[PDB]
């Protein structure tokens with residue numbers, strides 16, 4: 001009657017780590033009754049004063065968040081609400097990096113966080129190539145182009161039309177158009193087929209880096225501003241190997257479960273089994289070292305250069321984890 005239950009109090013204590021890399025997100029999922037995305041989003045919105053800035057009624061925010069979280073599939077091992085919550089929270093920490101202090105507007109911040117929250121929504125647990133090759137409805141709907149990522153956007157935005165779900169109801173049309181475009185640009189950039197171009201552009205930006213007289217980055221056009229936000233959410237999406245090993249390993253188990261399940265479906269149907277998806281011919285450990293060497297380390301090393309030296313502990317953790325996995329390959 002006015003005061004928190006005890007479970008709620010334990011949850012609130014865990015949520016004091018919301019500004020830290022290494023938040024116990026799985027623990028938060030258990031303590032919130034499988035509402036990690038709702039509670040983490042709500043905490044971040046309060047912390048960054050987004051409800052007041054964007055005149056978001058609190059009941060509307062909570063209704064939307066619960067609705068959004070309910071459209072992540074609980075029967076999907078990796079691409080579920082816990083992953084969404086993790087990417088949100090990691091984006092939130094990245095946005096607070098000292099090298100970006102006062103760089104981004106409140107609308108850009110809103111965009112990056114909202115994008116993170118909706119980015120994998122209604123994910124079926126299989127890849128774009130799988131959807132294309134099976135002639136699935138999603139693939140037909142999006143003419144085989146960034147199928148899943150188009151769908152995540154569409155669902156994220158459509159859910160705003162459910163009863164008391166329109167969290168953007170008080171924004172002007174100009175704010176809504178700008179928000180929408182940024183969100184679209186960010187989520188589409190989460191398709192791994194875009195990774196090499198995103199990284200090439202991030203490298204170019206590091207090579208031509210300009211800093212303000214405060215020492216933070218100078219980003220004076222939309223293209224550079226959106227590029228940084230796109231890479232930031234992409235870093236968050238690829239942040240698992242940079243976390244404390246206990247967290248990383250859980251993510252690895254989850255992604256492997258998801259991939260192996262896809263592989264079983266491919267094998268059942270006589271399709272070629274996708275990379276890392278064959279449980280009879282897999283090395284989990286070699287796959288992780290490969291993932292780090294070819295994808296995650298080149299990205300995070302370049303991000304670390306951009307924000308030097310803010311990401312040094314993250315990069316050190318990544319390199320330790322890489323060595324750990326390497327040492328378990330027989």
Ligand SMILES: COc1ccc(C2=NN(C3CCN(c4nc(N)nc5sccc45)CC3)C(=O)[C@@H]3CC=CC[C@H]23)cc1OC
Nearest residue numbers: 190192237240241251252255275287288290291292294295
């Ligand atoms: C915890 O461990 C993981 C978490 C997530 C993933 C994902 N992986 N990929 C792709 C990455 C490239 N992939 C590779 N393929 C091949 N042949 N070689 C290689 S070497 C280098 C990789 C690689 C395919 C999957 C996705 O698109 C997911 C959706 C969005 C972002 C990342 C997600 C992966 C994890 O661990 C492997």
Ligand SMILES: [Mg+2]
Nearest residue numbers: 119120190191
């Ligand atoms: Mg995705």
